[PDB]
């Protein structure tokens, strides 16, 4: 293939220079499991057992024994396939643009295929990270003009049937009020028998700034860590900041038994076989990627929104 | 078309609510991560305490007699007899399970002792307490008190607005 | 319910069964504190011997 | 079959895409192994 | 309740293009003529490899109808819905129900196929109404190539040739 | 296994004595294909193509070509599993009942396992043939108290959307009227493109006896059977016509083609009687065994089977 | 593997059932081969 | 395992080995 197709060879030779997605820092290694799918959905069946009554004592003769029941629950996760197109220089024409310092046309913004693919893949990876964190697909700083997505395609911030707390705009700068809402949400958290797990908190930069203020010689960050340790069996609590959030606080456990990320094995950018060609020196290439695959247990994520108005 | 979809969804939801184990899917996982009070579900078929010497029969089902006292219903004679929800002098047994693909109801005869969760009439569910005597009404639902020995071993459990289950021990026939 | 063949799009099936994990009661005892005995039902008598200076 | 394996020689685009997917998986595994919170 | 369930299933399947409905008997294909007069026949009767095809989020059910662009408050992207008159943007020639995506041929590209007709002879001049259905006469070049074919009491199709604005 | 399961060994030894089903005469060899299924259903998808417009002439340069579409249909065939139980003598207890001329307990109606299994298998096979022919399961000659079955489980006689003709009571013996009704049904048959196929007719014994009389001035050289064969050869492109008699029918004439394209039988590979592994045992000499069999799997095209009923009352 | 072949030695009831089914199929095939209408 | 008694003994030994492994791999 590499003898016949130059683009595949170039992609193979440059694929190692693409940085890893930053969403990996929001999950544990045990939480992520790939699936073989491009577009469609995946049914996940969870089996459970329950005790009908107290156990039966084995003494003398007895025929009536207590029973153990079984039950199943079906979860449907939707996956969607998306594509992008980009223009680049032709391999047979690169030699007419190979300057001593670089390759390409600065005047016309025309790049070699390898560099163009690397940059496009990085941009698409950033978009995928934004989707995984927020659950919406948009390219604007306002977050509007969102792409319409299928149902059962959720992110960490828009997952339904979770705990939602809202801080009024009057209390938008009161860390005591924000922490009161956080305490209420943590009390409403239901982690059951899986409560012994590390916890992850994601905050916006403004909340990160407010956290390092002295507690009304202790800090609000220390108070929050202690409060979360009070419920996670005093295990690790990790704090992360993301510029993709705005006045939002996300708290969730890093437990594979409660939250699982099952992305498609083709989620990250992949070249398409089709290459547009003509008589000029400009060619077009396509990059595919797949979105979807976050599964969460009900009432296991705390989402705090600090209203600005 | 959206309104027709909405009506379709409401009616399919009602029919699912009138079922033991509907094919219903959701984006999330149900929060069942504790080992206590997990048997209070409508899909809990069979009995809580079952013997290996119990006589079990299967019959064609008329309607949905799941978790209800059943009676023999006969047709014009072209087709075989079947079982439908009922009680009183017509009581023949207790339906403990249904196979929906074949439409077959699993019945334990009244001559055999039974212990399990059964449907309770939605009138005195709050007044039903352990030890109270129960009888089967004309719809196969248990009610507080004749010819049937049935004792409640627990209180009512509200599975749905109009669905209440009670743990009951059905002995057999009374004087 | 979808009125088209939605089962066609079910191109992946994952079944969660879990695994028999170690009991959490082990965390409440030291390794030396637990010692198995050979019995199924009934009672077993253990004798503790002791010494003192007169 | 992965792009990291130098002995791997793809025959067609399907094998190439499988190699890319395996490379991404191995890079994720390596990142998690080298991560120290 | 089951009877009402079945009736509503029948109605929504009648609205849909390719409903999944099982049968107990196999059908026999007797002839090779007039077999394309069905709602499931997507695309055009004559298609060129140089045709321009787009896809949009679908609002309502615009299959085999003239589509117009519709904009919301701005939170979500623009979509397409059945329409005509001066708002005509293109012709919806296909729908994917799983993704809810409508395939649109722009008005700048000529189309020849079967489209929904309002509840008509070859050579007649047609116009798109506000519901996207064709009706007898005009800012769009629409010409009927055959008489109306009835698929349901409210559903009629007609072979039409659209070749741009007038 | 044969060194530890006497019942399995005996079934293996006596399985060759059971007669073949008579339903095999009603189908061509290519019209039967086994399916690996006990209980459930089969989904069969049939694909078709159609032309959207006239062909395109290829001359000079052209980009717009006529298209060809596609379509599909899905058919569901249900299958059901059924069981019977029968008592017999325990293997170790046969010596205390072996007589000079017979083995068993005549006064108590008890048999060895081999003979009991053979008889039960024969009865079950007769029931299976009756179901395949009629679409119903009943142990009475009146046809009442029928077992309730699943939809999409039909026989050759109760298959929906076929051609049905009824001969009035006042003309129950008028062969001219019977043949008029048969001709009307044959005209109403729709075999489509597959009309050039052999045909099969099944009649009751009384109708079979009626068919052998000379054709009626009571002209010789031709029988009503020959007239019927010619009438069917008119529609089947002068192909072969076969005639069969079955005591299961009663004042019924059934005509259908022997073409796999139109009519097919996909029975389960476990349709015929099969022993169950469970054997009831006690402290006495009486044991019980179970036999399993699967019903279902007839697939027919609509308006391809003609059924003529001669009303008596 | 069928019961018609005396050399066949089953191991379990599942193999016995499969042999019975194969025997039935072979019997029907032989019947259709010997049929003469 | 020859018989059910040996199977049960093997299960008990496996449980004991799992407990020992858990205590060896535990770090408080």
């Amino acid at each position: 293939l590499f003898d016949e197709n130059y683009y595949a060879k170039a992609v193979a030779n440059i694929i190692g220079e693409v940085k890893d997605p930053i969403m990996y820092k929001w999950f544990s290694p045990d939480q992520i499991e790939d699936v073989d799918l491009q577009m469609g959905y995946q049914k996940t069946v969870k089996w459970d057992a329950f005790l009908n009554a107290n156990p039966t004592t084995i003494a003398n003769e007895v025929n009536t024994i207590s029973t153990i029941g079984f039950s199943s629950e079906v979860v449907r996760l939707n996956y969607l396939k998306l594509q992008y197109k980009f223009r680049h220089l032709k391999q047979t024409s690169e030699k007419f643009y190979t300057s001593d310092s670089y390759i390409g046309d600065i005047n016309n913004n025309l790049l070699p295929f390898a560099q163009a693919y690397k940059l496009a893949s990085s941009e698409i990876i950033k978009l995928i990270n934004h989707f995984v964190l927020t659950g919406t697909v948009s390219i604007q700083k306002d977050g509007k003009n969102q792409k319409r997505l299928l149902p059962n395609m959720y992110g960490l911030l828009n997952m339904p049937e979770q705990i939602k707390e809202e801080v009024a705009s009057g209390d938008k700068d009161k860390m005591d009020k924000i922490f009161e809402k956080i305490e209420a949400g943590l009390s409403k958290l239901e982690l059951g028998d899986e409560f012994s797990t590390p916890m992850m908190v994601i905050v916006d930069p403004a909340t990160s700034l407010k956290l390092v203020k002295p507690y009304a010689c202790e800090k609000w960050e220390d108070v929050l860590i202690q409060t979360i340790k009070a419920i996670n069996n005093r295990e690790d609590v990790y704090i992360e900041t993301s510029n993709l959030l705005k006045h939002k606080i996300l708290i969730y456990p890093l437990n594979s038994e409660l939250i699982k990320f099952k992305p498609s094995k083709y989620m990250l950018p992949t070249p398409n076989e089709q290459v547009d060609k003509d008589s000029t020196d400009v060619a077009h290439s396509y990059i595919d990627f797949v979105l979807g695959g976050l599964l969460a247990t009900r009432k296991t994520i705390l989402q705090v929104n600090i209203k600005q108005s | 078309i959206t309104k027709i979809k909405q009506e379709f969804d409401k009616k399919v939801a009602e029919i699912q609510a009138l079922m033991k184990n509907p094919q219903q899917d959701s984006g999330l996982l149900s929060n069942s991560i504790d080992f206590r009070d997990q048997n209070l579900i409508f899909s809990n078929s069979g009995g809580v305490c079952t013997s290996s010497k119990d006589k079990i029969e299967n019959y064609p089902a008329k309607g949905y007699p799941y978790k209800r006292g059943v009676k023999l219903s006969f047709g014009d004679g072209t087709t075989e007899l079947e079982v439908e929800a009922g009680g009183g002098d017509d009581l023949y047994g207790v339906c403990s399970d249904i196979d929906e693909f074949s439409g077959m109801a699993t019945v334990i005869p009244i001559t055999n002792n039974f212990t399990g969760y059964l449907t309770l009439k939605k009138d005195g569910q709050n007044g039903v307490n352990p030890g109270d005597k129960l009888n089967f009404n004309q719809h196969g639902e248990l009610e507080k008190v004749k010819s049937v020995n049935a004792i409640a071993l627990s209180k009512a459990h509200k599975l749905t607005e109009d669905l209440f289950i009670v743990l009951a021990s059905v002995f057999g026939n009374r004087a | 319910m979808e009125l088209f063949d939605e089962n066609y799009y079910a191109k992946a099936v994952a079944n969660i069964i879990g695994e028999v994990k170690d009991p959490i009661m082990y965390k409440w005892f030291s390794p030396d504190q637990i010692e198995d005995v050979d019995l199924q039902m009934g009672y077993q008598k253990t004798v503790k011997w002791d010494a003192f200076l007169n | 079959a992965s792009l990291l394996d130098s002995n791997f020689v793809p025959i067609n685009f399907t094998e190439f895409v499988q190699a890319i997917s395996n490379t991404y998986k191995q890079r994720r595994i390596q990142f998690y192994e080298n991560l120290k919170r």
Side-chain angles (χ1 to χ4, degrees), chain A, chain B, chain C, chain D:
Chain A
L1 167 80
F2 285 175
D3 294 357
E4 318 163 1
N5 197 351
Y6 158 84
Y7 298 109
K9 180 176 184 180
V11 159
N13 290 124
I14 192 166
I15 195 62
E17 297 173 54
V18 185
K19 288 185 176 181
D20 298 309
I22 72 176
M23 45 169 198
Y24 289 164
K25 297 150 55 175
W26 307 326
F27 299 111
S28 72
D30 202 6
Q31 273 178 296
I32 308 183
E33 186 177 1
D34 298 358
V35 295
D36 193 1
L37 178 60
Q38 270 185 357
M39 163 173 212
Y41 75 78
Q42 165 198 2
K43 276 180 176 173
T44 293
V45 192
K46 186 187 187 179
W47 290 97
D48 300 295
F50 53 89
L51 306 175
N52 296 115
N54 294 313
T56 292
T57 303
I58 299 305
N60 289 350
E61 298 180 58
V62 61
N63 291 308
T64 300
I65 317 295
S66 292
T67 51
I68 291 178
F70 294 103
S71 175
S72 58
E73 183 199 355
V74 187
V75 178
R76 173 170 168 177
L77 286 180
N78 284 355
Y79 296 71
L80 204 68
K81 186 187 182 182
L82 305 174
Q83 200 173 65
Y84 265 119
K85 184 171 68 170
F86 66 98
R87 47 181 283 199
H88 56 101
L89 276 176
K90 172 158 46 63
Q91 180 255 328
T92 62
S93 72
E94 290 166 359
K95 50 167 54 183
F96 305 116
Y97 305 103
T98 54
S99 169
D100 295 359
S101 306
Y102 60 88
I103 312 175
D105 291 301
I106 304 191
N107 314 121
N108 300 303
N109 282 343
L110 215 48
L111 287 91
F113 170 71
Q115 304 313 303
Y117 178 81
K118 181 212 294 188
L119 298 186
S121 305
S122 304
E123 292 306 300
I124 295 178
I125 287 189
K126 298 176 183 180
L127 183 69
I128 294 178
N129 292 346
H130 177 73
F131 164 69
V132 174
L133 181 68
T134 312
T136 68
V137 171
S138 174
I139 66 170
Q140 302 179 358
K141 295 182 176 180
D142 297 351
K144 301 184 178 182
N145 296 114
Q146 300 172 2
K147 185 176 194 305
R148 197 185 73 181
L149 295 183
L150 293 184
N152 301 353
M153 278 182 80
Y154 302 113
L156 283 169
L157 196 72
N158 66 343
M159 188 70 77
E161 290 189 359
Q162 307 288 345
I163 301 158
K164 290 192 170 183
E165 301 292 298
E166 184 178 296
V167 182
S169 57
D171 292 331
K172 70 197 312 301
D173 292 1
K174 302 181 190 172
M175 264 297 315
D176 52 300
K177 298 291 193 171
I178 302 173
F179 189 61
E180 187 176 5
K181 286 300 177 180
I182 291 177
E183 294 180 69
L186 290 182
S187 75
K188 298 172 192 179
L189 266 182
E190 303 175 0
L191 304 190
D193 290 356
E194 299 282 354
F195 70 108
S196 187
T197 177
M199 302 282 298
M200 168 64 74
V201 184
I202 306 186
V203 288
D204 63 293
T207 315
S208 186
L209 291 185
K210 301 179 185 178
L211 284 182
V212 307
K213 304 301 177 181
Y215 170 69
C217 185
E218 192 190 8
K219 306 309 184 177
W220 289 102
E221 172 172 354
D222 300 352
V223 182
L224 174 77
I225 290 181
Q226 289 163 5
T227 309
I228 300 179
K229 280 184 175 298
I231 73 168
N232 77 344
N233 199 9
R234 286 169 187 71
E235 293 180 354
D236 299 303
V237 177
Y238 306 122
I239 303 188
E240 292 274 354
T241 310
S242 184
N243 47 351
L244 313 179
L245 290 185
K246 282 164 291 185
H247 316 296
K248 314 280 184 169
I249 307 178
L250 263 176
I251 306 181
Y252 62 94
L254 294 176
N255 191 2
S256 57
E257 316 298 298
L258 295 182
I259 302 180
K260 200 146 196 178
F261 189 37
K262 298 183 171 183
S264 159
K265 49 180 304 179
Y266 312 112
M267 158 180 76
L268 288 194
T270 304
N272 192 295
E273 198 179 2
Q274 171 72 8
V275 175
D276 294 355
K277 298 173 179 181
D278 57 0
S279 55
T280 66
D281 284 356
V282 173
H284 296 74
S285 294
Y286 304 84
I287 299 179
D288 299 296
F289 61 105
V290 179
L291 285 196
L294 188 66
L295 164 66
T297 309
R298 185 182 64 75
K299 284 212 173 188
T300 54
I301 309 176
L302 167 60
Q303 310 151 352
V304 182
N305 187 359
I306 315 176
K307 261 207 165 192
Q308 304 296 292
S309 61
Chain B
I1 182 167
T2 66
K3 308 175 182 179
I4 312 179
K5 293 175 176 180
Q6 298 155 1
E7 305 152 2
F8 172 72
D9 294 0
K10 311 306 160 49
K11 301 304 297 311
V12 73
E14 306 176 4
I15 306 187
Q16 282 194 358
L18 298 193
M19 261 174 204
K20 53 160 307 185
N21 189 57
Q23 189 202 4
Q24 188 174 359
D25 50 358
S26 174
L28 279 76
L29 287 172
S30 179
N31 217 354
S32 182
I33 61 171
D34 178 57
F35 82 109
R36 299 173 296 236
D37 294 355
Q38 309 293 299
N39 58 303
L40 307 189
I41 52 185
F42 198 58
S43 47
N44 189 359
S45 62
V48 289
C49 300
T50 308
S51 175
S52 56
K53 307 297 158 50
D54 283 309
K55 185 179 183 185
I56 305 171
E57 306 172 357
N58 56 354
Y59 283 107
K62 179 183 186 181
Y64 190 76
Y66 183 60
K67 286 192 178 303
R68 287 173 178 239
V70 292
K71 60 187 168 189
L72 290 191
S73 63
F74 298 176
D76 187 58
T78 308
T79 53
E80 51 169 355
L81 61 83
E82 56 192 3
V83 288
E84 56 161 354
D89 292 347
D90 300 1
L91 184 76
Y92 172 69
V94 170
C95 178
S96 63
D97 201 3
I98 299 188
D99 186 6
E100 307 166 2
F101 174 66
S102 55
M104 296 297 303
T106 291
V107 169
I108 300 185
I110 196 61
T111 60
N112 192 65
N113 179 61
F114 176 71
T115 309
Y117 280 105
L118 293 179
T119 309
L120 178 76
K121 173 188 177 183
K122 209 267 189 181
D123 203 4
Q125 56 99 13
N126 194 32
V128 173
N129 298 299
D132 292 3
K133 294 175 184 174
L134 300 177
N135 64 296
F136 282 109
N137 62 1
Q138 49 166 358
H139 308 301
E141 297 176 298
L142 277 176
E143 45 178 359
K144 193 173 177 176
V145 185
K146 32 183 185 181
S147 62
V148 184
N149 278 303
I151 285 177
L153 306 186
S154 77
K155 288 190 183 187
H157 303 294
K158 177 175 185 174
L159 292 200
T160 301
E161 291 285 357
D162 286 359
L163 181 63
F164 293 70
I165 57 171
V166 54
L167 180 64
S169 180
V170 179
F171 303 164
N173 286 302
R174 195 199 161 242
Chain C
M1 269 177 207
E2 301 307 301
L3 277 296
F4 60 86
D5 188 4
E6 65 182 0
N7 306 348
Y8 171 68
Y9 300 114
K11 304 173 181 298
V13 174
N15 296 348
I16 311 180
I17 311 298
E19 186 47 58
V20 171
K21 302 172 185 178
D22 302 303
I24 74 179
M25 46 177 194
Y26 291 166
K27 307 164 59 181
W28 308 325
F29 297 110
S30 68
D32 202 7
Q33 274 182 303
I34 300 189
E35 162 199 357
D36 271 357
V37 307
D38 192 357
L39 189 63
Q40 264 190 358
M41 178 159 197
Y43 65 109
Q44 171 168 355
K45 288 194 172 182
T46 291
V47 190
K48 176 192 179 180
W49 281 113
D50 189 358
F52 52 85
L53 306 179
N54 273 117
Chain D
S2 173
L3 291 184
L4 310 181
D5 293 332
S6 300
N7 293 358
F8 164 71
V9 171
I11 305 178
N12 46 68
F13 213 74
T14 310
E15 302 185 6
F16 180 58
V17 174
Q18 300 311 300
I20 292 177
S21 296
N22 299 357
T23 298
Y24 274 132
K25 174 181 183 177
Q26 288 177 356
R27 289 219 304 173
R28 178 182 66 199
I29 291 176
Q30 191 169 1
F31 165 82
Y32 271 129
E33 276 191 0
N34 307 356
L35 176 74
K36 31 189 179 179
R37 291 172 182 283

